[model samples]
Target: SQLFADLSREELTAVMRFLTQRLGPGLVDAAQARPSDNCVFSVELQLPPKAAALAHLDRGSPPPAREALAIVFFGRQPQPNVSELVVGPLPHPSYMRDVTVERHGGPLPYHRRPVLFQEYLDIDQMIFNRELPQASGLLHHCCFYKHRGRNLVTMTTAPRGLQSGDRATWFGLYYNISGAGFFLHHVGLELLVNHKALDPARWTIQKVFYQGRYYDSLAQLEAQFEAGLVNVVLIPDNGTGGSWSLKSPVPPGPAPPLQFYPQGPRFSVQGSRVASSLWTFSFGLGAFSGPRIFDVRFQGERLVYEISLQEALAIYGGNSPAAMTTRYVDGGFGMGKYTTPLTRGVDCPYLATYVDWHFLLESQAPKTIRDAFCVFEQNQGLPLRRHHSDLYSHYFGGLAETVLVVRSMSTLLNYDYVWDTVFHPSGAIEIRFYATGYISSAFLFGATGKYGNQVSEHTLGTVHTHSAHFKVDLDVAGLENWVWAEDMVFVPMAVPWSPEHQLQRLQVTRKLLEMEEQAAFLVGSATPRYLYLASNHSNKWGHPRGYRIQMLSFAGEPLPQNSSMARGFSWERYQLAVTQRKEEEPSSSSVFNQNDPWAPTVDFSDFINNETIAGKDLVAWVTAGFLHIPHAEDIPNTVTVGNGVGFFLRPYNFFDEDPSFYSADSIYFRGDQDAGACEVNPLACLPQAAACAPDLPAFSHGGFSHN
Candidate 1:
């Protein structure tokens, strides 16, 4: 299994001196930092590429000779800028190499440290007169300063207004920008430009903008403060006179049948730490990108070495300025830090057993997050396999289908990323991304066109797209495997039987993406084709064993060219891409990419470096998402009903026959006549020798008990 460990305090301090020496004392020694001292943000593990890790794990070769570190520092210089440093060839005092002056400014990632939050309240009192009554959720700092400079914060204090019949549109819902839906909701009490300097006194609101105007000087803005006229467009918190209510809340009519797991978890798990069983998986957290899954395997065979999330971005468009510069990347503020603890019977089932998170971000020792992630088995109130045929005597057989699920939900401020990785008995792996939660509501000053739809009086539900690049490394029958694109191609050739026979299609054709040039292609709305990785060795059937990567859900389209929003995220240019496995490209995204808008530390488009991928270890990148247009139903929050999409990998010809045939959990009896009971698995039940069968002919079609 790949060890995705974080940078330790010892390693961080060791590298700090090297960075400080390179940049000079001007570099804020974030190592010896206090709430009062301008400090370096954080330093974390930059994983070695898949190629290197495999040599060590598969070939019993020496581990990669070097381990590297990626560091971030913040403080006062000629001007404040967030800079990144990469150093390695470890276990020694290092020499200076290169330092990157990042484009990141404003609030630092994971700016939730109490000291910084307190500074915002003290300095911005001029705008938000009272204390910041809002929780950390309301004040987001992910939106860039929109200029060509350093760490200067641009903030908007959008009030979650309480309403009366007089006016109050969408209010009382906590609006968060640091959750970095940083693309919308710029309207508020005032927009302030705050700064972070070592000296507490140096921390101040540098500038202010309000009511569609800007003020470089603070004095003039203060004198003009007055009670502004409220727009009639404001919606009522609730109506003035609705006897009961404008809309009656729906009531639950029926409840699902419940079962108690008196014998503990249905699925067997081994190893108390990193779990194992029919399938073994492990996960951990990073500041920016939330939780990541690694070392996924089934029945002792490594299927997906790692299934990691690169980034989650949403781009907005509108002449209304409601969400124009609003291209948002959730990692800007550390999505994993905002992850909520899963509730017992709510987020998961009562029977679900959870895997506590071993978060190593704090002190020297690792700490545990009570219930960060959950793993459970659910019936889904449906069968995975069941069939009935009346052709002969009419019989029904249900395989008693069920699935094991691992889930994690990160509330990226207003939005929620409900991620689930499912394991099936058929040895297939599946994933589901369910997005729900608050929409970053914005002021529609002039938002009246297709840029967005005005759902309410002055509220424009903006249009945006949430797409991400997911990294999937496959190991088929062995580590030495190759990938293929399969599809049926029809040719206008006469049938061998006679010319009378029309053109016919032969078997599916295989395109072995020979070199890197052929590895990447724009598959936005392209024809039906699925990629599969096969073992170099042949199966008993004389064919290579393989598993197919299929599009299980609505694979969304990418942004079209000529779109300003599209320009912001170059990766959106291609929906699917793959690369020849290399030692330097372990992940599809580098969290530091959020620091430089112009240059992503990891460019997914650049993954395809011209190398022949045929007959080589394979890694594929798959993207899925949608162009979302907000509607009335989306006013409060986005529901997961149909607003989600994803894809899963399934067993192609990896196995010779039905994998389901191995299950001894099958039972057949209408439940009406308990004749011969279940034949196998003593745990299911005992068999009866004979039955009192005099009432067999007395069946009727009156009700459920009649037949």
Candidate 2:
């Protein structure tokens, strides 16, 4: 447990106690006074500089336990409820930045929206609850839906149409845990509310969509129900019921002997010690961003400083009240704020190491998620590198790849985004995001026929583009780094060296990007090869040390300039971008970029001004996502299969040779000349052959088997 320990729980608890003492008992009173009482929002172990962490870790000790707190002071406050506070400078050394105030629209929209969600409760109560009156634990997840392209101002100028007097917001609803996940369960309802600064009363219900019928106003909805004109139809919940074996309809046999680990976890996480020759990194949680990892290293050399989540945009297209107004910029309202507590045996492996994420609310009340994140070693069940000479077949050996995965999940309304940051022993890091759970549906009276396909009877599964963004700080061999493009082009030419030889040849040309334009184009199709972050540091062979990024998933470019999506997140137009690093410009897009994406608070275009990126503290922002065109199969929930995308930060020519070649977990089989003979190392896994299994129990009725 001491492995990679940041701030210890007791230490964080002490700081929490310290902050409580400093703030006084008024905090509890303030929390109790609110309609929804507050508690510790989040407490993060702020690890020190890599050098500092390693200094302690190298000597078998955890890094200095410095901590930061995110407190949400909701309800009774003019000051933003969400805040970023710290104990590292407060006591370890005093104050920290109140990140809430600085942003123009991003987190403000995200933070304020949660409070306004209460208004929808009253509206829902008027329609769904009414005479019954709700008890406890009724409404599920509640948050603001992103304003889709400034409320259709370009299409209509009528008052209160979308963007006029009051900025309107849509609130989606879900019932209970119908399946294994809270996101899958749906009451199948949507509410439209108008937000204002003058009065809370002005925040009125503009419309309501349920059972394919759209009511212009709440009065009409209530009136229709009273007059027996409304048909209240209930939809059945289709859930996994907590039972998940395999996706293959006809389930496969009992999973192959439960991939055992007798000696316990294969990888060692000794504090922040960058294993002498292996790859290792730690996990971090952001207020809006989720699972940001940093201080990545291989063999004690820093390759990347940080890899963070900028934001995730889910833009929907439809012809209904529900679909027309849906554009959910999940981070706009904060991702970690609604982080789902990882279930021990369900969300992760039973033996997976759990880490706590604690924080104090704006009211100074603290909350702790005991299992906020999880880390475990999983054998990939495949070889990292293997080959055999079919003719001679002198030797045979292949090492199975084992990966260390740091994981966390966030539930954005009806959908769940499962993120896994994987580290391979061969010195590679991959960022993977898979989405599952209910598809946010549009209530179509009949088939619109053009936008998307119908999922259920009335629910039209709207076509959407879910693009994920990340801010990567690739600090290659010190700060001054370079972005290079190695192009593989084919040239049709006869052999000049040999007069008789006439075979085609391939010429690879490496180019350097000196100026910063839009690097959104992941692959330079015509001149395709690969991109790597290489800097001054070089291998023994004199090749600049580099980490090759292999693109795994990507759909295409941003929408046309005239479309709503184009304006919603123009920053996502590219799949890859490299820029000179700046302390002030940490993220490409702001929290409220979706509020007015056209005039977004932090547009990435502003960052790319033909800036010189050669030999600078470079950062790469690589995007991996796809355009989700919904079909009948995507009715209930969108599977992670086709929509999922990822990329890898792997060793290029940085290492002397393939690291897998040095692996001890490999067996060698003698050639055909020495047919049945084989030589094995103690570290390698032996098959259940006669020599490997001395005695075995029989699963037969005849008799006990002995090998």
Candidate 3:
């Protein structure tokens, strides 16, 4: 048979030894290599101690050991070349019979010859063509046949539901005779699907197969084959197939039925009653709570008090003649008589908030004033003065004795609007004061002597019919010094003539010195004082002839102190000369000659000449004329002048009230009704006043030369 020829004696011995070792020496014996009746070789041995220990320790005792045997047969049998050997206890001690050899054709004959158990033999068994059943409900057997010197094995599945292209796959344990080892191989089943209507991308494979292990004995082979086939392919109702599916019918019970019940109401009668009672108790507690109403009296009272005029005067040590008559007139105008109705001018009250009057009165020279005037004249295209007398007695004379009047208003008034009317005097010469509650305003006005028909007139009348609203800023200490009358009644006026023409000028001067000859005059002083002058083109027409504005020295000296008196001509010299020129043409500078008989030189030598009065030689004299005003103490000290029909000066006092108040007029003059009235009277008010002359020669006459 093919089985006998394929194995050498040595290979046969190796196979026998390997099987004996794997099954334990007792279960498989190499002595079974000898063949006996029906070409079968068989041997049997007892289990070793170790094998017995393992079997007892395992879950079940070792299966009954069958006889170990190997054989090969050569014959014209109806089956393929196959071998049949018996390895069993001949009969099952348990439920299954163990010694049956159901061959391909029919039952096989037993090997009856009794040879020595240790004798080795060689035998071969021949298996002819065998037909496998088309289908079987139980296990069936088939074998390969040796045809034309080749051996072939064929496996088939029942055609119950399987089709031609369906897969039949399995895994089988194979024993190699030459290598004497066990290996597992997969018999893959493949399904070939062909459908022209369906896309190739959708095709898939399916398989059906059987798999098992092979042994040297038919009995063991058949048992293992049935087990493998059932385990791999059999399907049960519960989907897992094994011995359990074979024994039981109903799918393992129902998995225990789930139970469910509806929930009861969340709250019962007792719980609801408890909640309602809690709410009622809370409400009752709240009803008993009382509000804490406190009755507190702040007990605060505000008392307002004011100092009467008498009391105010008493503050300066009773009605001292000097303090009572200490009236300040800001702008220049002729004062004829202290008693004359026309001579009675407005008196600016002492700003209580700005109590430091001396700060406004500290005398300075005329340099600041002269410099400003010269610059204005030059910028306005006017000529330089040629004579000192003409400059002094005419133009700048009104500047003397001018006190810078300042009025302090509460935070309620508009400073710029209030000062506009006075700054731009209507028909008369006037001056307006500025007050932010701090510094003072300084301005210059009047005529020069060169103009022959200069009419100097002083007028007094209400220019605007508006009620003055004066608001007072109160102090934390209940002081009400800034109080004002909402209906302030007053007539605004101006001076058209110089102070030299009014008789009252002399009376005011006399009274002023009589009170205290040592006290400084408002203007025309020999002492020096700070002064400011500003002008614009819109308001240049109101000035008079021979009006020369100048600041005085501490010694009553004219500024540019060394200049000759002859050069102190009035502003008229420049104004007339410049105005007469044609607007379209450049003006000429030679209006007056330096050595001309009509032109005189300036003399500054006795400009600050000392004059004695009441055993006191006064150093300076501020002539009581001209429009110069100051700002209130609470205002910042910056001065600003604009170009318009009028000029307004305002001080911004960051330290006190907002928006300071300004004066209501724009011009001022000097002299009282008791003094002599003359257009060019040098001592029109004070006849005993000292006279000084100029010392420098005149430079130009008519106009200034560009060269």
Candidate 4:
């Protein structure tokens, strides 16, 4: 019944065949496509318009045509550019419509295209086989030299350059520690490669940065070193250590406590959709944007149309060129493409239901990431609500918290983000992100302490901040909604009973945001304590049916608007903003913005053009993040303890009474009642209910990335 399922393998293959037949014989597979070859860059499900989808889902109209969007790289043509095509009617495709002009206004520049995996390999080959040879003598003294520089690996940084059309990159070298943490091993060598030319043979090294000095080229650096004019720092290669590998030297300890279902698992996973007693949602992963959920419903009514991650940004500060100039827009590298498989019992619960993801990216055939997602139920070890009536009636009432969770882990270079959408029994939804993994480091040198702390003898853990933008298309009760801000205020007034006595009375202040600008709350500015989207429909108590948006984050200061690349992720400036929803304004940031930030493809600030938001379908765009000044505890990997940030969609006046009142998990008893009886309370029967041992599956892993 899910009309939003991602395109299947058969559908992908059919689209590939149709495009191949129409584009002629010159089309090459993206996996093998060179800089001067035409190939299909990617293909994904073209989401049906909201109006069309609702017409079918609500009014029983015929379903909208299932379609796929194919991005083709026309590198071999006279006017080499990128084209976006729409291919229709799934099981078989016969028609293709070009939508390049309709979406981007003009053809997407070839320079704005995402760097291919093959392109990275080609750059590596060029550096190892051609460029590195020039600095062989200098490298031999500093790094363990290899015939083709096999002992070292290069890590790429972006925006590429300071302007829009430049395609040069700064590549940082590090020791290659197989099956270990190599990010901490910086060799203090960085190269600026200008690969703007279509022909790889024409690429040239623009500059070389070694230690604290800069040279015009690697040949110049070699000459200076051989002339006894260069001061080189020798870096020892300690291949195996506590900081290098994940393996612990100590013996394994006893297993920790585990959770199991007493009566059996309550939820069911049908394809991409998950259904519990009170919640139902369809989940999918975008190739570029990462995780998203659709048609989220509680009980039988839909509360949200969509909730998705649009982009993840990281800005770093260091003395090194690669570190100082690095502002990574992770969507550009493809978050979904780099999804790391979840480790059973470690990344998720031992009994979690793991699902695989299939995609047609660079390869002609579809590839699958086994165990890309995990869905399970977690006991929070806390009470959702509890009241002990010892003062009055000597009774107790409470409900244990058990939430349904859907999660995915994406490893973008050194950072790993654990994304989750949690469903609570009390009609609340939580969107969470937990960041963990290796921290990106630079070579420690003069003034290194100004930027960050040094974790190792020669490695400086760079200071950076992580921020993620989210799109929340909410239909609280119906499509039309209004923004309401409520906060507590103390007013100077006389005491009600005593006219002479002055008092500061606490009062509730309410405001109805009339336009988009009024609803956009800037970061570091005062905002209402309570912000919610309300429908005109009223609850039994005559209050507007509404859902409150409560943010729980430790956001860092955003980049100043005067900065050149700040416009690329301008949404970060506003902690939260409510805008009129439109099909054209779906995402807050675009994948193309990372490459050409000066001319952002989708400047999010443009979406707020003083449009009237009263009684309109609305979207709440949220930005959540934190600053990381790496400390000593950040070694090995960052823990999820203090690094988690997200928001909650809670019921404000949307319900007449607490929805958890009818929950089967609720427990209540009076002083005179038999609290130990199974009929009176469920917790009393847990000893008997959980007598049987859970069935555990044999341990297995999804393995590592080939690259």
Candidate 5:
């Protein structure tokens, strides 16, 4: 009551005055022009005739018809629609040029095609009725143009046998919400057309039927097309829709109260169906009458499963305590065990084992200054002839010094220590008298690419065939310095693909002999000794293969009366040399023959030549020495092949420290008391004894662990 009372006579008069000013003048004008912008316009404005008719139709009532002549401008039986026009030459054209024309005309003769126009009414009435807030609320409404010409040209010379002459282009109509209201605007279009054979190839212009004159340029025409097609119809303000049909028998529910929920799934099945159908019909009318209709639906689940560290590790390998221990050792042995007494022994063992193991694991592992410490530690107590305590301390200070080296090397080489194993002599306080080196096969050889300008003059050698000979010289200086040993023996073996030259081979042999002679002259002439020529070649015809060891004896008469008398009565004449070839195959069989390009053949006669008498003797004596060392199964029987008088020495001995000899105590008892009887008796000793701890569990070997 109060609200109504407040709107007094003055307020009512003001409202009426406002309404008259806004509606009175328009109402009179609309009544005068009712139809065809006159009489029809008046009826639409003064009375809701369309609403009345819609209501009557809904109520199942027949509406009155007016007698009028109807003329059909265009029949709607499937017609060609020119949605877009694209003109371009072939990608790889044979010719190119430009042309100018003075007169405007219809479709050019080269474009023997028909153009049609069709209007697509937006079925989503809400999209057309609702005023967008900004320019962003534009939906993709593609207008496609298809070439209807029967003899359409393509990229290939062959006629389009099964191919249709239809090529489509898409034009998008967007809502320019930011401009005025829900303004429909042409955003862009891609027209697919070919001007591959045209004299002047360029994009075609669409002339807008506006202002009574064609635009001068294609860009200008496009701007006009955009302007004409783009305009805003603010929700129900523009005369694009009639007033709400309130006269219907079943009146529409109060406009559904315009619901807006921010946090809602942007897509709904109903919305999808409406949109798909709208696009389908829109393109279909615009010459995209293809049979297939594309409809997209969610195909797979979007949820992802996350896993924990333990679960991931379980998939790879379980927690391995052995591997953990090895890694701890590798991380500088006392990585977390600095307080342990075992850390004392840990330094040498850990560094030696880790470096060698890593080297074997990754061939061509980087060499570093730390290797000096490892070698030194390995032979620590072997008695250095000269002492440089300050330099030694400065270079290697046990754990602290070695660990620093390890870290530096690891950083430089980018190597992560994954695993390792180490062994030491029984009852030995420190790791002394041992040889440690890594054997690996993972060597890589690759060629560098050669470009004309990028390459340097010095780098030219890399482009063509080149060869290198790697002579691996062991730094036995560590052993020679620490031990009172006179000579360091190295028996060279042929690496596969490495050519064995007689001169090189003789030079190497001579070096070994010269060292032995020096040692014999210094230590003693009758030094009752043995030499091994170990090779990674076991088969008769040596190739790239596994390992083998052969031995040679240089012991003089009576063998100096040693405890182990096996293979006694030494210094007997023997010779060794590369095998000889028969005269019939001289050209093909001899390594000495320049004409024969094959690897040299080996025969017994080559060992006995006049020039190779000493070599033959060496080989024969070495064969005898091998006969002396007992086999794995026969230790008690010392005279397996060669003469026997005392303890047996094993042939497959891989002793790292020092060569072993027979002693009287070794024969009667099997203990660590005797010195000379310390031969690595393969028959009774464990394999890999000096490197890996013999008593450690087999399962505790070194390797990476997932845990």
Candidate 6:
């Protein structure tokens, strides 16, 4: 029953102890680790293979040995690099196996490792204590200058340099406002700092960008400013404006309407597993990839092996160096590491059940994120299905659209993503994500308006695209499945009774996609209206039992092939793809793909080679997103109204009839029956059932700081 549980605090502690003993005395706690120190970068559960897991879950075979994966940074070794080790039988690990070569073909380049929080601090120390003083005169005249740049902060960018083996990062300077967004207050100065060397002393500023001009060094700019040759644009520190903080500028008004349960909660959360009348699944957060669910079942029958978030990518365009060249692969920076706690009522329903998450990353001790997830039932204010007859039988029937939802929030730097996985009574599951937060802006300059609209006097909201990929490993009726594409077409045919006249007859076209490449659908391509994966087994109506995949996306065009970094996230080229599922091909993107894009750690395009997919275990990969041209509405915060994207998995001939037809919440009435009677109509009971007041708790928040 605990096959897909996440590693507990005790298990994480045992793994740390085991790894410390095996790696020797050189190990350092990652929180306090230097660039040249050896430390454990991360530790997470290593999910067991599906074959072995099913053998134990479905049959009477023994369960697979539980395991933990450790990513260790060996920066002090002669050939410094990163290594991955598998620690087995968690809670009391006995053996450790080095999987560097087996996983990455060789040692992972040390330069490709994710930047630790301490590394960022070291970089900031260099800039504030050493670099900014050279341009003191210009800073004092244009900005509210402070020692060590305390009046300002640095925001980092990705794909460090133009090519591989390069570790130069572009850090943009911004106003440091307390409890407010700093991304919108760009100071018109950026530095390209090269920190490739193991020693912090060797790091140097490679280039500088200030006020629409490039300088070899800040000293050169200061020398020019002294000679009165540089033109400086004075910027006022406007921190108390409505755009700065989330607090409403107006007085408190009447409260908005709230949702309440008339009877009581209809679902239950047991550990990491959730159970309702129609659905049951185990949920967990990937230390890098964010949220995932496993062993998804409906009414005691398994429907999917796993469904998960693979990666989230954002690419921007602007005249500034950081804006033009920035391409973010969020998983590389650890989506799970950036997960924020949900507030009591604003982030979720007031009565929603909250859950906590535990992890060990960049630290020796395990820390917990309180209220990291929320589960609740929501009434969509619409009917799942309804019909009324006033001409003949005069009967009425309908069911409220109530959904069981599991939600989590991830604040990756400036943007907050609301992740929701919902289940309906009709045997459909929906996965959706909404983006809202401060938009990234750059200093207004020549041709900046062409890239994006000017949101402020000196700031241009940079144009960007947000896209996320998902992995859906559905077991239609069993392990063996086939992909079927169905579409409608108009065919020219003659009437059967009269051949004298011909008419266009609508017909359904079905095709079996036998090869992987055949099932890979490119963006903007003409996809079948109905695409589903089916088993050989048939239903009562003699049709193959299947689940249909319906995608809802507003995705912009993918990066052109000429871009060198396109391969880093090649999966974005396809809107939907299906291939044979293999244990080795668990994820489409890798955590190391961000730093070194020239040589990707895992190219999703490589997984779509021409392989037979008929009657095989299959995995469907979906991509969804939109292009965001930030405008005035994005000033306070980007709203989620039209900024959401996702897909749906609906039952297609999986059952003989609509499963919600028998739902307890369904309502049916006839002219012969008294509609006001409690025994005849459920709605009649609402007057007495909802008379009591909802028990609301004192409002609480997740706090301003992430500690």
Q: TM-scores across all candidates?
A: 0.72, 0.76, 0.11, 0.98, 0.14, 0.98
lDDT of 3: 0.18
Better of 1 and 6 by TM-score: 6
In angstroms, give how far residue 156 of model 3 lies from its true place: 99
For model 3, residues 1-707, the per-residue Cα lDDT tens digits are 11101122233343344433443322322233222112223221111222332254333675434322233221223332214343332222111222224422332221111121222111001111111111122222222212321222211111111222221111111111121111111111111111111122332212212222223322333455566543333211122212112233466676543211112211112210101110110000000010000000011111111000000000000011111111111100001000011001111211111111000000110001100000000011221112223433432222211122112111111112112111111111122222221111111113212111111111001011111111011111121111010112233334346543333221111111211222223223232121111111112343111111122111111123232312322211110010111111111111111111022111111121232222221111111111212212112221333211112112111012211112121112233333345444434533432343222223322111111
Query: In candidate 1, what are the lDDT values of residues 1-707, reduced to their tens digit?
Result: 24455444455566555555655554433334433434445545556666566678668877764454444434443444344555764545465333453323332332222223344434444233322222122222222222221212234221111111111011112123332333234333243333334454444443343334455543454434422222222222222211112233677668765544444456754322245346776666665666666667677677876776666777666543324445556665555655666776657775566655433232223334556677777766666677775665556666766778878777765677787778887888886687776665555554356676765544556677777656677777766667777888777787777876777666787767677656565645563486777877776687778888765445445556554223334555655566666665665655544434343445566667667766776777766667777776764566888755666788777887656766655545443444344443343453342353222222211111101
Q: Candidate 5 at residue 243, lDDT?
A: 17
- Give residue 102's error in model 6 in angstroms: 0.9
Residue-level lDDT of model 5, residues 42-111, one tens digit each, is 0000011222333453355554221110001111113311111111111111221111011112211211
Give the per-residue Cα lDDT of candidate 6 at 50. Answer: 95
Give the clashing pairs for model 6: none
By TM-score, the candidates rank as 4, 6, 2, 1, 5, 3
Instruction: State model 5's lDDT.
Output: 0.18
lDDT of 4 by residue, 1-707 (tens): 67778878888888888888899888888997787989988888788899999999989999988999888888897799988899988878878999888887988898888888778888999999899998899889888786779899999896898888888899999999887778989999999998887888899898889888998888899999999888777897874564677888788899898988867899999789999999998898888888999999899899999999999899988889888999998988778888989999999999999988878988788777889999999999999999999886889999999999999999988888999889999999999898898889898888888899988778889999889999999998989999999999898998888878899989999889989999998889977899999998999999999899988878878888999888988988988999999998878887888888888878999889879888999999999998999876777788999777999999988999988999988999999889998888777777765555886789898876452
Better of 1 and 3 by lDDT: 1
Residue lDDT tens for model 6, 475-574? 9999899999999999889988997599899999999999999999989887899999999899899999989999988877898868888899998898
Model 1 stretches astray by more than 4 angstroms: 1-40, 43-70, 74-259, 268-277, 319-322, 358-369, 387-398, 490-507, 523-527, 552-569, 666-676, 680-707
Worst 10 residues of 3 by lDDT: 306-315
Instruction: Report the error of model 3 at residue 606, Å.
Output: 6.5
Ranking of predictions according to lDDT: 6, 4, 2, 1, 3, 5
Query: Which ranges of candidate 2 are over 4 A from the true structure?
Result: 1-93, 96-167, 172-190, 197-199, 208-216, 221-256, 270-277, 344-346, 361-363, 390-393, 494-504, 518-527, 556-568, 590-601, 631-637, 672-707
For each candidate, how many residue pairs have backbone atoms clashing (under 3 Å)? Answer: 7, 27, 176, 0, 26, 0
Tens digits of per-residue lDDT for model 2 on 1-707? 33233444455555666655665443543323332333344455543554455456556665564546444444344543444455654244244445555544334432332332343344344434331112111121111212221110101001112442245556544433323333223344556655444244334566766556777765565566656665554444343322211243565677433433554456554443323236666656665666687667765676777887888877666755556656666775566655677776557765666666644332334455556777777777788777666664566666778777888877666677888788877878888888776666554555467777665554566777777888788877777888778877677676888756676677788877778773435332322367887887788888887877776655644556665334445556667777877765777664444444444556665567778877897788877777676665653456777666778887777777877777666555546444343443444334443443323222212111110
Q: Which ten residues in a row have the lowest lDDT in candidate 1?
A: 160-169
Give me the candidate number with maximum lDDT.
Answer: 6
Model 3 residue 289 CA deviation in Å: 92
Q: Which residue runs of candidate 6 sit more than 4 Å off their true CA positions?
A: 494-501, 704-706
